[PDB]
Write an enzyme that holds these catalytic residues in place. Structure first.
Site, short mmCIF file in Angstrom:
data_model
loop_
_atom_site.label_atom_id
_atom_site.label_comp_id
_atom_site.label_asym_id
_atom_site.label_seq_id
_atom_site.Cartn_x
_atom_site.Cartn_y
_atom_site.Cartn_z
N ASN A 48 0.81 -1.23 0.00
CA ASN A 48 0.00 0.00 0.00
C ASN A 48 0.84 1.28 0.00
O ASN A 48 0.44 2.27 -0.60
CB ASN A 48 -0.94 0.04 1.21
N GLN A 70 -16.78 -12.00 10.44
CA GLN A 70 -15.58 -12.24 9.63
C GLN A 70 -14.54 -13.15 10.31
O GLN A 70 -14.31 -13.02 11.50
CB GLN A 70 -14.97 -10.87 9.31
N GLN A 93 0.32 -4.01 13.42
CA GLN A 93 -0.40 -5.15 14.06
C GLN A 93 0.51 -6.14 14.81
O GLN A 93 0.02 -6.94 15.62
CB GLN A 93 -1.25 -5.97 13.06
N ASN A 98 -1.02 3.61 15.52
CA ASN A 98 -2.43 4.02 15.49
C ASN A 98 -2.79 4.12 16.96
O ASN A 98 -1.96 3.77 17.81
CB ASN A 98 -3.35 3.11 14.66
N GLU A 102 -10.68 8.68 11.32
CA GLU A 102 -11.56 9.85 11.06
C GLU A 102 -11.25 11.07 11.96
O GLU A 102 -11.39 12.21 11.51
CB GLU A 102 -13.04 9.47 11.20
N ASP A 131 -1.22 4.14 5.03
CA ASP A 131 -0.07 4.01 4.12
C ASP A 131 0.05 5.22 3.18
O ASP A 131 1.15 5.63 2.81
CB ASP A 131 -0.17 2.68 3.37
#
Lengths: 284, 279
Positions: free
Chosen positions: B42, B102, B150, B173, B199, B227
């Protein structure tokens, strides 16, 4: 000129994903990842080719996923001319997540759902296993039709099942699929000659209102594709104009050797096969 | 000496869409498609659009990554430092989704067999996801950007503190910054640190102060937003601009990729950057 056998099925890729625990939701690390090339058409083709049984393989593959599978079977001398190659499709491909204590399969038909099969030439036998729109082809031809719906038994209606069975020269089922068939159709016994396989226990032949049992030869190994080895033994008999009893016995013996030896390291001469077949016949 | 060595993943996400994920047994796949991504990928895609000179360092398995390499090569991205394992597959993630729920099956593959060696001398070296990069980081004299992402959890308390202390900048993050503070016991950073918060924008911790940079209202695909932000940060660093400039460049480039889509003039960026400064 008329050919011996057209065989309709899947050239399926299983992507085997081994994990410690399949989660409810979230990520997990894959301990092992490997493909397995198989399916109803593939497993048959690989075994049948080893016996030099003539056949035209009819299937549909997606070139996004099936380039190596095609290359492999072609390297074995298997003709893929009647395999439809969809350039912008994937599949048939199944992603199988396993921990031992559970298993979840994500089946993408892909190319097999996109296929509109057309029977090119005339054949003595046409074997219809898994795939789309087979009853439409079955109805129109004069070949000896083998009806082998396997895991797709559920997609046919009652009338489609009775029709396909009644026009068939032989129907083939496993124990579970035969119960589903009888139930869906309302037929208590078969209207035509019918083979019912029963994994490790063997198989049965319903013919002339009688049931003939064929006990399995004790085997230890990979049982994946054992049904397809059995089918290859059946066609070996049919090709050599032998009895259906002979075909049941050939299938039983070949299935056994492929489980124990593996198809890669498996050879078998017709002299051994024939002797082993008469031994089996006398014993039962 | 080259400008940047960027370490990360060239991840293929295999997106498996079904009506319902079963507890056991089979389910028909409605839609099946790949998404080429990961930290290295990315970044490389966005950074290449701004012609930023970087050397992408990664490891891919040729059983699965040939069409990915094809794509980045057609964009002009050099894959000379991307290790190519003929027998391996991956890094690849099989993501089964039904909207409501998921499940992901992550296969590192080639990334788990990679022993990275840093060839040339670089001004900047960006260590994101992949093997334990601390052994490399310790030895080099470059300006190190520590971007654990991560994989923050794989480093011990002492490893996190070390990598952070030796870094020119650390980036996280919001979730990873919480994880970082708890593992290390540090209440505030020891080196200049960027903390992104989607956001809600991002924050720059520098000289014992917190400089907040609110995001530019966007609507679209958020995949790779972080990225794109990093590509804007390196755009300012490449052009010898200040860190404040990099934060703005990152906020603007991220916004444009979300709205206008990945598939901007330098004069346009300089004016939009000036208009951001004035609210």
């Amino acid at each position: 000129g008329m050919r011996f056998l057209a065989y309709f099925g899947h050239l399926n890729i299983d992507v085997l994903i081994s994990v410690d625990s399949i989660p409810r939701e979230g990520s997990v690390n894959v301990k092992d990842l490997r493909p397995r090339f198989g399916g109803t058409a593939g497993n048959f083709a690989i075994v049948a080719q080893k016996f030099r049984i003539p056949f035209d393989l009819y299937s549909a593959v997606g070139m996004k996923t099936h380039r190596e599978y095609l290359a492999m079977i072609e390297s074995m001398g298997i003709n893929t001319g009647h395999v439809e190659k969809f350039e912008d499709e994937s599949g048939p491909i199944c992603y199988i997540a396993t921990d031992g204590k559970k298993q979840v399969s994500f089946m993408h038909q892909g190319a097999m759902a996109a296929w509109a099969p057309q029977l090119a030439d005339e054949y003595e036998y046409v074997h219809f296993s898994t795939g789309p729109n087979y009853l439409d082809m079955a109805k129109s031809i004069r070949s000896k039709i083998i009806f082998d719906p396997s895991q797709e038994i559920h997609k046919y209606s009652k009338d489609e099942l009775k029709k396909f069975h009644e026009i068939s020269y032989m129907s083939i089922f496993n124990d579970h699929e035969y119960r589903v068939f009888r139930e869906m159709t309302g037929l208590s016994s078969p209207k035509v000659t019918t083979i019912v396989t029963n994994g490790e226990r063997g198989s049965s032949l319903f013919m002339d209102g009688k049931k003939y049992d064929f006990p399995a030869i004790p085997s230890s190994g990979d049982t994946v594709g054992a049904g397809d080895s059995f089918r290859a033994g059946l066609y070996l008999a049919l090709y050599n104009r032998r009895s259906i009893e002979k075909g049941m016995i050939y299938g039983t013996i070949i299935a056994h050797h492929v489980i124990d030896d593996g198809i890669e390291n498996f050879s078998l001469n017709m002299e051994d096969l024939e002797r082993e077949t008469e031994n089996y016949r006398r014993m039962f």
